Design a protein around this ligand. Structure first.
Ligand SMILES: COc1ccc(S(=O)(=O)N2CCCCCCC2)cc1NC(=O)Cc1n[nH]c(=O)c2ccccc12
Ligand SMILES: COc1ccc(S(=O)(=O)N2CCCCCCC2)cc1NC(=O)Cc1n[nH]c(=O)c2ccccc12
Ligand SMILES: [Mg+2]
Ligand SMILES: [Mg+2]
Lengths: 448, 450, 458, 449
């Protein structure tokens, strides 16, 4: 319940709080959602402030005692020790300056406990602006989410689907097109399709990384780098790559584009949206395959967590959320003006949530649904044995003309190809029953 | 770190948790977002369980000591005393069964501390199913959010915009179409338009209430009411109306439509999305009018909250973007129901209830901390209106369109009023008196304000 | 070809073209989509110009011979006689001024063929501006599309679904929740739900009309009505209402809101988007119910409309549910474009009107046409597989609950387990476990396991 | 009318139409939008039918005389001689069955004029299904639109923006953040940012081509390739690459994914949506720069088509349409079932429209707006030199309090910062003229030379 002094009056701040007057003013200004920055965003702000202090110390602009104090305080923030010291709403000034100042104030308070006096702006914000910091922290967090978390979760799900594609390679069943009975396929072939969708999703995320990983740091207020060293960005990026192991981080190709727009977030959200579209098809097919057991398809059994398909439901709900988040991201992305896009906090919340939801639900889907599925093999074969057949595989035995007459008579009389052959008296020296049954065999028709 | 024995083995539950084994299993099943139900959600689940116990008591199905214990526990939940006892992810089974069971378990644990044993399922879930309760609670929460919170916040913003319209009635300035200079308006007329956008917003929310207030309660598992009293729904709705004062709550017109779809939430999100569209235009015009102080429009000054940056217009346009995204998620969930149940309810509820909250909170902040304190550069706005080439048309009948165009070009080049330019070019004479000039160039008259 | 002279220079225009130099310039300026105004928008521009000429005549501002020529020409345009004379891209100047000028030029050319000289701007655009005309025509077209076309088409679909709800009142089947077996319902109850969705859709459209029907006419360039009669809007609206019978048309509540924003189109699109969401659920349930017919649900049969496949010649597909679900996807896309344009107005004018108009009027048209086709070519001819549906209901573990009070919940679970294992009815499994006796008579068993009574039909 | 027939019986068809019974049933079943396939789609179906007949001929499955007749008729269709013979609505059966049969029937009728009897299904549809042909035609049309049309249009717009970036490299002006005055930039720097957004757009389109160019051909009804030669897809793709020169066309990595989903269209629409987002920012900044001529920013003048910013308005309306189309595409993409995604005609309409609108508006914007912009150079510099934002580098010489008084007086008197520092008598005690001109050099402050 302490009291601090701002250039517009008094400011009451909780006693255990490491934040100062500017953060408290932002708390009072933006009571909108009641939610603040996520752990990933706080970590990236800590990483960035430590790297900037490191580079300011290397260039001789910041006394080594002050840099050491910022570096140690920043490492605690990056390590998750101060996730309760960031109370500002997501829906704040659209540069994210409020959160940038929150980080400067918390580092100054941590340093003061260790006996060092730091000015939040002149020391902790040295060579930085109110406008190049929060977007840099956003792109660090998004690139870490893509590379360290989403891609491995998607690979786990790909591997689970591919393992079923191989197990079920000869588990024949009926194909369905337009929801209507079609020629045979295998359950393994369908899973090979699901696995390719997830592999393509990993390709889509990898394709966005050259632009997602672009950082604005060094551009300062408008992109020109005024009041920063000319090589500030390239030096800070090198420290961040070294500390995180994220080789995908890079300086911006164009310092104006990197601050006037957040196009890299819009691009990345489109990859995540495409993954949500793929996951919707996979999850829907799996719940339909497990439907019933008397009123539905009853092709597979899902693991029980009459089992309701609770992980397909979680997957499809997550996909809906990614689709909505993606619309919010593109709306903010389009609406920048001149030197700055002022939708960064909202865009950051949405893209980081989409990464988190897809990573977590993919791992759960892989481990607690896909890996445990069991096929109802005898039921699936009975469905394959009820698919339509074709005459083509009889051509070499009865010739193009008799085959065509079998096709026509089967259609007219609503008979199978097999029975129409028997009924036309075609079993003989040209065609044994055995040869009929081998030519029309449903696993052979699946071409597995 | 207390222990519990489930149907399927052992479960460890935190010591001070009031939830039980089925909630803890859902915590383990759905570690997806790390975000659970919001306060409004949780309150409505308490309201619903209290009303259900009241009705089961009234019908002689539930012993009164048990009903009384449920009603007392449910009132604590409705009063927001147990918002920390609902740990299940939003991204759970799509009926919201897990959160329904979370409510039943917390009520049983609260009751147990007052010395009354309740079975979560057989007592707290009596006459209810796993499918008619969560969407009922969602529609209670959304109807309360609309009536009690968003409409009053929009009315505050409307009244702030209308007050500025009246204060700025005669504040004449150049009109802008296509971003280019146009004939005069007043700042008051522009604010009267903003006020109408917000008043139409309230009309849009009021128009969705007949269907937003429809509750599925009493439909049970598939909408038929099997295993519930025939009049359970109308009885529970009547208790909710009596307790809350929300007369907009009603039984559903069709019990199958009320469980197979969530179309009322999709409809209400469309009203919220329209309000977000209106707020985007109002907030964008206000930040543009405050742009400068040298190279921008410099029409008005915003109050300084943090040369003021337009931080509340930025909060408002960010909220609007979130409402538009949330709206897309809601419609996606709404379209994808199957047969007797739409299984996107927890995701739809998160998104609709967030949209109500953000619009309510940001509308009040925008009204109080931005709109109320705007100041206009009155004399500057009038000087620009009086200096615009757009106002030479009323001279054409005195001096011709060719001389009126030379006046417009010289006024702009020399940074002079049209009036001073007409005088400087020696046009005052028999053709045009000083008084006829001041009548033809009366920019406030050109704006046609009441 | 024939040549004309614009303020800029010389312009070549097609011989049979009733448009003039401004329209030809717009043709050369915006070769973007290769699609121009639809017939509903052209019709509305004709209605508007005819009403404006009538009022300008009544007020003594326009000579009667000139007003009479504009009225005659504008009636030809409203009657669809000139739908080939509007070549300008949708993607034009955002006020729609190019299309307004196209209308003025075509009316002047029609009048010229009857010996009357009309100035496109000073006569045909009298009392109007480049900014209050196109949004007025857009709202006339959208209101007409809602009231005269979509609501009747939705009522037709509602009536077709409600007729099935009555025909199938006793057709008992298992319910499905989460795609899993549930307690009994009737196919009539499910169709009653579909019907309510469409009835609610009509209520949604009706709820938006007080604001969709607001017209900007009379507000002129900025909303102030400068250079128009003070009562131009109310007089033009009176003529349009009398001539069209569109009682929903009204003068805007606020003349600045009606030009600075297009919020009524955003609102109306939300109703259409909600109808698309409802239609998606209805169409998806119907194609699933008709799936198979050997490997699917096979609950109903859809009328056959065309061959499905050359490789599998017997196969017929649910083509009308597919058309419906594809229309719904288009309406949801159109809705997103409309809200995008609606948010992005500046000051006195929203300059997204041609794009918003294209999208809202297309959503009306697609929903109207597909609703009628779905009602007539799919719903009306559905047939139910009654005995299949009842067999599954009578075999369902879900229906053992009503036995609990006779034999207890544990023995009822054993009946469920055995029946499901042995593919038997519940009735027959109860017998095969000799539970009929003192506790349970055979008439009593048949009363407890009455699956139609469990559906609780009214 | 004349009588034609199919497996469902007899159908009345317009006496002279080149389509037959299946197309006519589709005319009556789907009168929804009143719009059919676009020129690009009809071209792709013609290309594909010709390539299929070449491969069936090469494998000895189809008589050379019949293959020649198909190839010639398919060439007339691809060239646009028979577009009026494709009457079927976009909103047809979701596999594109109806438009596939339309192509087969029209080819058979054209071949008959030349005295060759072709069966639309046994000959023109040999080794094919609608399930692999209609999505193949859609991905051909989309790949061609990306490579031959949109990337060159974007490169023209990039080059026009980059030409301004160079021309305006020293055109110093006030920076704007939050719409508020900020430290100096140049118009050239802002245009270099717009140019980067369009170059990144080109990178985004190129990044999607490995998947957009995947073709389903050879997968037949369910992806298994039943009723087609095992190498049909690889042979047909080789013919298409030879004929079109589109090396980006390729056989699908997985034949089941290529028919059960249209994820490549969803992916490509995301690139187009991102370009729409970039174009919105560029066009909105340009119309604001041109605003006025008295009460707006008045930084630049747009070419006249007091000019209204009509091409910025066309660009921002096109962008809105691409965003809407992108939502419709993703909705269709998610909703496939089992072996087939049945939203292909609607997804094809939307993604091909987005390609076309972005191509056409990008070239118009480049040639008829960007190329002709003029800057109010001396005005922009005067405002930059008069902004309170540039007083900061004086703080160390005159103090915060006096730098604030300089800013306030400069704004009130409408004078430069340089002239205000002189007027307040700060030269000599605080700093010299040499020092003043170094500290307030706005072009140096923009970090431009
Ligand atoms: C954001 O627009 C402005 C911002 C600040 C100022 S000001 O007060 O600070 N100041 C600037 C010049 C130095 C001192 C003289 C007084 C005018 C003027 C302006 N507009 C204008 O100067 C408008 C204008 N008028 N006439 C022209 O021929 C013209 C040509 C090109 C561009 C615009 C125009
Ligand atoms: C769109 O902004 C403008 C447009 C046109 C003009 S102008 O050249 O045509 N002309 C305007 C009318 C008076 C004639 C003398 C010169 C200024 C100026 C401006 N801006 C300004 O005057 C900027 C400005 N400077 N200083 C102030 O204390 C002030 C206070 C309130 C608002 C703005 C300011
Ligand atoms: Mg690496
Ligand atoms: Mg079955």
């Amino acid at each position: 319940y302490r009291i601090e002094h701002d250039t517009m009056g008094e400011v009451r701040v909780p006693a255990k709080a490491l934040w100062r007057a500017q953060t408290q003013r932002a708390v009072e200004n933006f009571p909108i959602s009641g939610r603040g920055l996520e752990r990933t965003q706080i970590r990236a702000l800590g990483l960035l402030k430590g790297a900037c202090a490191q580079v300011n110390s290397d260039l001789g602009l910041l006394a080594p005692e002050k840099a050491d104090a910022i570096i140690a305080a920043a490492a605690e923030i990056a390590d998750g020790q101060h996730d309760d010291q960031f109370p500002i709403d997501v829906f704040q000034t659209g540069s994210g300056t409020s959160s940038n100042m929150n980080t400067n104030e918390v580092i100054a308070s941590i340093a003061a406990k260790g006996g060092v006096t730091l000015h939040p702006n002149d020391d902790v914000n040295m060579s930085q602006s109110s406008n190049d910091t929060f977007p840099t922290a956003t792109h660090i967090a998004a690139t870490e989410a893509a590379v360290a978390h989403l891609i491995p979760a998607l690979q786990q799900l790909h591997d689970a689907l591919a393992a079923k594609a191989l197990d079920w390679h000869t588990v024949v069943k009926s194909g369905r097109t337009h929801l209507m009975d079609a020629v045979p396929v295998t359950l393994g072939q369908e899973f090979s399709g699901y696995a390719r969708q997830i592999e393509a999703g990993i390709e889509r995320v990898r394709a966005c990384l050259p632009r997602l990983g672009e950082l604005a740091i060094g551009g300062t207020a408008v992109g020109t780098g005024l009041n920063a060293p000319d090589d500030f960005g390239v030096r800070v990026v090198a420290v961040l790559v070294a500390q995180t192991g994220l080789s995908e981080l890079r300086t911006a190709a164009n310092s104006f584009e990197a601050q006037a727009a957040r196009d890299g977030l819009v691009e990345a959200s489109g990859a995540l949206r495409t993954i949500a579209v793929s996951l919707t098809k996979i999850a829907n097919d799996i719940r339909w395959m497990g439907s019933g057991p008397l009123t539905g398809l009853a092709e597979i059994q899902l693991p029980d967590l009459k089992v309701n398909p609770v992980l397909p439901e979680a997957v499809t709900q997550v996909a809906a959320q990614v689709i909505g988040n993606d619309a919010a991201i593109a709306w903010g992305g389009a609406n920048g003006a001149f030197e700055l896009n002022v939708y960064i906090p909202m865009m950051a919340r949405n893209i980081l949530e989409s990464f988190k939801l897809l990573t977590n639900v993919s791992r759960l889907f892989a481990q607690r649904c896909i890996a445990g599925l069991t096929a109802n093999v005898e039921h699936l074969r009975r469905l394959a044995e009820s698919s339509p057949s074709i005459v083509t595989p009889l051509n070499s035995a009865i010739g193009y003309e008799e085959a065509a007459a079998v096709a026509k008579q089967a259609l007219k009389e609503r008979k199978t190809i097999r029975q129409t052959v028997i009924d036309r008296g075609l079993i003989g020296d040209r065609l044994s029953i055995e040869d009929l049954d081998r030519r029309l065999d449903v696993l052979a028709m699946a071409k597995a």
